[PDB]
Amino acid sequence: VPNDILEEQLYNSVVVADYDSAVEKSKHLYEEKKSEVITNVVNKLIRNNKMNCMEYAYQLWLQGSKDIVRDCFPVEFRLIFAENAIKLMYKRDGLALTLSNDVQGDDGRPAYGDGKDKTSPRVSWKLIALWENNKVYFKILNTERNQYLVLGVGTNWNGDHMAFGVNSVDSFRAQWYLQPAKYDNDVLFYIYNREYSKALTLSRTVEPSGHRMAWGYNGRVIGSPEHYAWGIKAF
């Protein structure tokens, strides 16, 4: 077996979502001094906007291969799965996501891109994996407020949903899946809601203080991560 065939095999395995055999292959290769194959494969999954890349990483993390995820994937993956604190930064506008600090309701805090704040604890978040139907999904937890990001049931005229924090996860509205992408020299992700299949985005309508409210966008984003995707920073 040449690197081409072995690589194609590993990639094929990831794309068809046969994760036990993809992990078998990886564990083999990392032992046989063939890390460049796994690394090329990651790069190709990530260039091709393949979602399976998340499940593949998580399966390595769960099956005694954290080290492969640490060495052969970009640091973001480790940041996700180690449930380290992160900042979700909207690529298009360069704002960090947060929850409002002043709320007249007892229920949920509205989410938005913070105009002044890239630093304070208010932009700290954590992603929490769960496994269902051969797929990986995430709860998104604001660390200061101990509240989960959700989309609501209501919609505006175009059919976007509001995003805000809620105390717990009892539905698919509070779950999310990631689709990796590349722009410039960095890794980005679109973030879709599990219930409604909409991407989390910031409105083009600016608030006086530079703010932009967060919405579940009803529209097409694939192809333009420099407009609709998020960077994950180590905080």
Side-chain angles (χ1 to χ4, degrees):
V1 250
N3 291 29
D4 293 322
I5 281 70
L6 131 68
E7 186 184 87
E8 277 327 293
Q9 283 184 333
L10 160 61
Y11 182 94
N12 278 359
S13 207
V14 176
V15 168
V16 298
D18 188 22
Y19 301 124
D20 295 342
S21 92
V23 171
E24 230 182 50
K25 285 147 162 51
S26 304
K27 287 177 169 189
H28 187 147
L29 294 172
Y30 199 58
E31 196 132 321
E32 305 235 86
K33 181 53 176 174
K34 308 294 192 60
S35 285
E36 185 192 353
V37 289
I38 302 168
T39 286
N40 291 334
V41 169
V42 164
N43 297 326
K44 191 180 171 193
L45 287 168
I46 294 178
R47 286 195 320 266
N48 294 1
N49 294 326
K50 297 293 158 170
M51 306 196 300
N52 291 20
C53 191
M54 315 286 345
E55 283 80 0
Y56 176 38
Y58 181 62
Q59 284 301 327
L60 290 160
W61 197 262
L62 283 180
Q63 274 186 64
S65 282
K66 325 257 243 220
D67 7 331
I68 295 183
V69 176
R70 294 189 177 105
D71 305 329
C72 300
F73 294 69
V75 53
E76 290 82 339
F77 292 79
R78 178 165 43 177
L79 296 171
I80 300 170
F81 296 112
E83 299 180 0
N84 282 342
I86 46 152
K87 308 183 189 101
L88 305 159
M89 299 238 13
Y90 203 47
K91 171 59 191 172
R92 174 168 73 202
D93 302 305
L95 312 189
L97 189 77
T98 183
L99 286 173
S100 170
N101 216 6
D102 221 10
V103 180
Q104 286 211 63
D106 299 308
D107 21 32
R109 313 189 163 263
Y112 62 92
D114 198 314
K116 192 165 313 184
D117 191 24
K118 290 95 194 151
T119 47
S120 73
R122 256 153 65 61
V123 303
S124 171
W125 296 84
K126 297 195 196 295
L127 276 52
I128 297 108
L130 60 116
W131 186 268
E132 189 154 90
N133 194 40
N134 210 51
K135 280 184 241 241
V136 70
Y137 293 104
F138 295 96
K139 316 177 243 197
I140 302 176
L141 183 73
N142 182 261
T143 78
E144 295 47 44
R145 298 295 177 251
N146 199 349
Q147 290 193 356
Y148 292 86
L149 190 78
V150 318
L151 293 185
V153 176
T155 60
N156 53 20
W157 186 245
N158 192 60
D160 310 339
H161 295 248
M162 287 183 157
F164 51 79
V166 96
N167 283 303
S168 22
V169 296
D170 196 76
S171 93
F172 287 177
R173 286 194 291 102
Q175 301 178 23
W176 305 89
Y177 55 96
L178 313 195
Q179 152 180 65
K182 287 248 196 52
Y183 176 71
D184 251 286
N185 282 275
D186 48 72
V187 47
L188 299 176
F189 309 82
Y190 301 88
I191 300 170
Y192 303 94
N193 187 253
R194 167 172 194 187
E195 178 73 33
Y196 290 124
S197 299
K198 298 207 162 36
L200 187 63
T201 61
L202 297 187
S203 186
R204 309 164 186 283
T205 312
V206 284
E207 310 301 319
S209 12
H211 299 337
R212 301 183 186 265
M213 300 297 109
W215 291 81
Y217 192 42
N218 186 32
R220 176 180 60 77
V221 303
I222 186 72
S224 309
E226 71 282 19
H227 298 119
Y228 306 105
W230 298 84
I232 289 181
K233 316 301 186 174
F235 179 85

